[PDB]
Amino acid sequence: TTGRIVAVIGAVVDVQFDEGLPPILNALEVQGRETRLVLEVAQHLGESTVRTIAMDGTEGLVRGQKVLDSGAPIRIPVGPETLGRIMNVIGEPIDERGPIKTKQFAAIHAEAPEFVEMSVEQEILVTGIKVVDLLAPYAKGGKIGLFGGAGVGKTVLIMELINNVAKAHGGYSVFAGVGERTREGNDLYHEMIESGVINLKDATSKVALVYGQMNEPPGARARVALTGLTVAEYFRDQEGQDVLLFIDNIFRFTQAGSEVSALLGRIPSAVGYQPTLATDMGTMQERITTTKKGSITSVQAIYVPADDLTDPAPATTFAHLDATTVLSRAIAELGIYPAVDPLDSTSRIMDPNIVGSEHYDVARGVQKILQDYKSLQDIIAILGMDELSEEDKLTVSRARKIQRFLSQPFQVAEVFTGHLGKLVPLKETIKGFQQILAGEYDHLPEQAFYMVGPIEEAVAKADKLA
Template sequence: HEMIESINLKDTTSKALVYGMNEPPGRARVALTGLTVAEYFRDQEGQDVLLFIDNIFRFTQAGSEVSALLGRIPSAVGYQPTLATDMGTMQERITTTKKGSITSVQAIYVPADDLTDPAPATTFAHLDATTVLSRAIAELGIYPAVDPLDSTSRIMDPNIVGQEHYDVARGVQKILQDYKSLQDIIAILGMDELSEEDKLTVARARKIQRFLSQPFQVAEVFTGHLGKLVPLKETIKGFKQILQGEYDNLPEQSFYMVGPIEEAMAKAEKLAEEHS
């Protein structure tokens, strides 16, 4: 209901919901069944289909259970020996034809938060982009808790997004990676043992971490912050200026849950007034 209302989908006649079953054989086939429905809309109706899969790990898990019931020798970490084949058979059907297309958004459960686990790793190989949610970032109170170091996208290319966007994105990833590398030193020896350059890296990285928080309209009830819509150019400009050190004098709290960078400046002034 919320999805229909939010994107104004009044005509629900072209929507289909396919649910799983309790039995492993049924759960192993439900993903293929849903994909067949999507292919019908694409090939017979000539439509562009948006296919949501929640959760693709259940497809892998069901295949593993069926494999065990059939007496097959398991492969790495106990998964079925045909894991790569099973996943490829399904994922490669999600494609574009002359009549229409299928675009899929898939939720992926990551066992023990291990991205190298065969189940998620096999799935990642077929995706154009991955958005990784991190418990560590959520613990900092930063939402959405997206990890920019583990998340990937094939369109992160200067020929597609533009040179400035690409350079700023890579700059953000570099400074966050440098900060991550320094965290063990900080935990053992403290900030005072860092060089001035490293201290500056840490300060800018912490500002960037908080600027990555986003006050979404759909999350107002959870965050308590009014939702903001910020144009892409404004977002790139904000991160570029932080990387260049233009806001080294602002406290990191001023970058939390704000829209454009100008709001961070206004928030910093407000914080200064409150502490004066």
């Protein structure tokens, strides 16, 4: 079927499709598009006119120009063949490596799965990072939102996560570069290649990259998320997957929506924010889950808008967050990669009623102790440890061991850590810190714990010294 450009006021393209008006969400590919310019039906304004959205660029929008309903929402590859591949929003090699084919293509509207259809009861995806699991238990199907110091090997870490998890767990990955810097993604590209997390040779990487960078128009930038989702559901259910969905950076979603809203004759509510903010959010959030088979776990780069989180948007976000991650320079500075400040690595669902009590307690002991030790960092800053007793010495030392012990070396940033990385199963992990808590290894070298994944290699390492 056809549309006419009847009005262009920018990328709100008033299209009159006159062979009926296909339901909102239908993708049209506009005819006369050299620059294959997809319009999504947004409103049926009537007059056989729809308000549609360019998710693409324009010009040569010679009026009345012909527009073609694809009869569906935008269809994009689904199926495994996306891994290792970078597609634009509209599902096309911006890896610039020829077709990112798949087998199945999908119209990308597909929303909010039924509550019963989940295994309504969700479960930690084991990261293996001691600290990670420990401090913020990461849930299969869950949304974890990654607040974090910039460029700190956020990415490095992340790459490593793919390595440990997307590898060790059946975890797959999606990278959705939503509104990201094309450049950083470029850089990153090379980084990924480099890291080997992405591979070309074989494209049997764990990650399909979808980018709908700043370059995209908001609708596109906005929408690269559903697309990414659409695949991830594919893998999730179909490939049963624990998909890791890196949605990077959600703020850009919010931003994309919000922008349009006004123009879209929608009151973009508080702060400008699209009145639907939540609903947008929700409908989307409901697609992130351990269904029955598979989980789409969303690893969400979260730019901290206005570093404000009461910030209605974040307030909403809170609802969407089971576990919250702030990556911390403070820590980083300590040479500790992980740069995680753990106090910001929580899950609201913390409790012993919920996050159960050894973990929790050991942790409680840990947050407390470390802090207490931190209280001592102020105290010691004055009094020195000399004026504190051995339980303090101990705590300090332990805290310090623990400190180091959160450090796990990195294959990637051998530059930051100094070396090749590890992996640490949880039992060992908690045991590890619990053990340090038992003070067992005296205070036989604590720098041993530095950049060692499992606790033992440090104990051993303490010995090689001692």
